[PDB]
Amino acid sequence: HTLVWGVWVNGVDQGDGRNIYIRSPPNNNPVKNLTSPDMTCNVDNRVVPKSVPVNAGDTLTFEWYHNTRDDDIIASSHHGPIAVYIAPAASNGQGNVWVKLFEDAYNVTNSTWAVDRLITAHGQHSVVVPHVAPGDYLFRAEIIALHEADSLYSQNPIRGAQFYISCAQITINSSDDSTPLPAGVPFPGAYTDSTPGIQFNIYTTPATSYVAPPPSVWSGALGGSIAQVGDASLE
Ligand SMILES: [Cu+2]
């Protein structure tokens, strides 16, 4: 149970974005139904009044929280991967539009899941803004909690993989468009009951064997991190 509070651009806090530049859902409950319209941008997908200005090559940092800013972030039980997708905003996230910029699942070197490192990072994970066409975009940040993912939601709706999905409105101003954005995958639709990484038993299956759900990270993606960029306590 986690939500995005706001974003940072090059380590500068853009301030509370809830219902302002984030398409915030009403609460931190997960999405679990893979065929739900709620898979796109969570349960309250609508245009919000602001879009955060960035340039290509900026560091864009998402900041998550549980109940209050810079708290426990997400229950430690919620081991799983983190992904970020991008789509042109005029799509409203509909159709074959979502392109993956970032994936971090289980780090063998560190013996930690992305969610474990997100807590350590005070809820902060980042991407490099890609060199796509200038214009308005949705950045879809997706945490998958796998602590109840041994079941399919479609078999037992009390369990299943848990999707924490947050869509930020981002406007890319300066971009040379060296990597034009291709078509991508649909949400809902890209994840199904047979997709690798959706049904996974963290109690019995080693995390070293986990394969995160496709699609693969786009060739145009410039990277990211799970690391504290900004100290919310200094504000
Ligand atoms: Cu939860």
Torsion sign across C-alpha atoms 31, 33, 38, 41: positive
Strand ranges in the chain using DSSP code E only, listed in sequence order: 3-9, 12-13, 52-54, 59-65, 82-88, 99-104, 106-107, 112-113, 124-128, 135-145, 162-172, 224-226
Q: Burial-class residue 69 by CB neighbours within 10 Å (0-12, 13-18, 19+).
A: middle
- Whether 187 and 91 have beta carbons less than 8 Å apart is answered as no
Alpha carbon of 34 to ligand 1 centroid (Å) = 17
Does 106 belong to an annotated binding site? no
Q: How far apart are CA 171 and CA 211, in angstroms?
A: 32
Does 4 belong to an annotated binding site? no
CA distances from 1 to 31, 65, 148 (A): 10, 9, 13
CA distances from 179 to 55, 133, 137, 218 (A): 14, 8, 15, 10
Does 177 belong to an annotated binding site? no
- Whether 39 and 20 have beta carbons less than 8 Å apart is answered as no
Q: How far apart are CA 127 and CA 223, in angstroms?
A: 6
Q: Kindly provide the resolution of this structure in angstroms, with one decimal.
A: 1.4
Give 113-165 as a DSSP string.
EHHHHHHHTTTEEEEEPP---SEEEEEEEEEEE-TTTTS-TTT-TTSS-EEEE
Cα angle 214-135-133, degrees, rounded to a multiple of 5: 65
Alpha carbon of 220 to ligand 1 centroid (Å) = 32
Residue type, 124: Q
Alpha carbon of 1 to ligand 1 centroid (Å) = 3
Q: How far apart are CA 213 and CA 185, in angstroms?
A: 12
DSSP state of 98: B
Q: How far apart are CA 24 and CA 46, in angstroms?
A: 9
Does 47 belong to an annotated binding site? yes
Does 128 belong to an annotated binding site? no
Q: How far apart are CA 127 and CA 229, in angstroms?
A: 11
Does 125 belong to an annotated binding site? no
**Beta carbons within 8 Å of 103's beta carbon, 6+ residues apart:** 81, 82, 83, 212, 216, 217
Alpha carbon of 27 to ligand 1 centroid (Å) = 11
Torsion sign across C-alpha atoms 11, 15, 18, 21: negative
Does 9 belong to an annotated binding site? yes
- Whether 80 and 115 have beta carbons less than 8 Å apart is answered as yes
Domain ranges of the chain: 3-234
CATH of domain 3-234: 2.70.50.70
Q: How far apart are CA 134 and CA 54, in angstroms?
A: 10
In the Cβ-directed half-sphere of 107, how many Cα atoms lie within 13 Å? 15
φ/ψ bin of 80: left (φ > 0), alpha (ψ from -120 to 50), beta (otherwise): left
Does 159 belong to an annotated binding site? no
Q: How far apart are CA 194 and CA 211, in angstroms?
A: 13
Find how far residue 95's CA is from the centre of its chain.
18
Residue type, 25: P
Q: How far apart are CA 10 and CA 27, in angstroms?
A: 28
Alpha carbon of 181 to ligand 1 centroid (Å) = 33
Do β-strands 162-172 and 99-104 pair in parallel, antiparallel, or remain unpaired?
unpaired
- Whether 54 and 170 have beta carbons less than 8 Å apart is answered as yes
Query: Which method resolved this structure?
Result: X-ray
Q: Give me 181's structure tokens.
A: 């954005």
Alpha carbon of 78 to ligand 1 centroid (Å) = 7
How many C-beta atoms surround the C-beta of residue 94 within 10 A? 13
Does 108 belong to an annotated binding site? no
Beta partners for residue 188, in sequence order: none
Alpha carbon of 163 to ligand 1 centroid (Å) = 9
Does 48 belong to an annotated binding site? yes
Residue type, 105: A
Q: How far apart are CA 119 and CA 109, in angstroms?
A: 18
Alpha carbon of 217 to ligand 1 centroid (Å) = 26
Residue type, 70: D
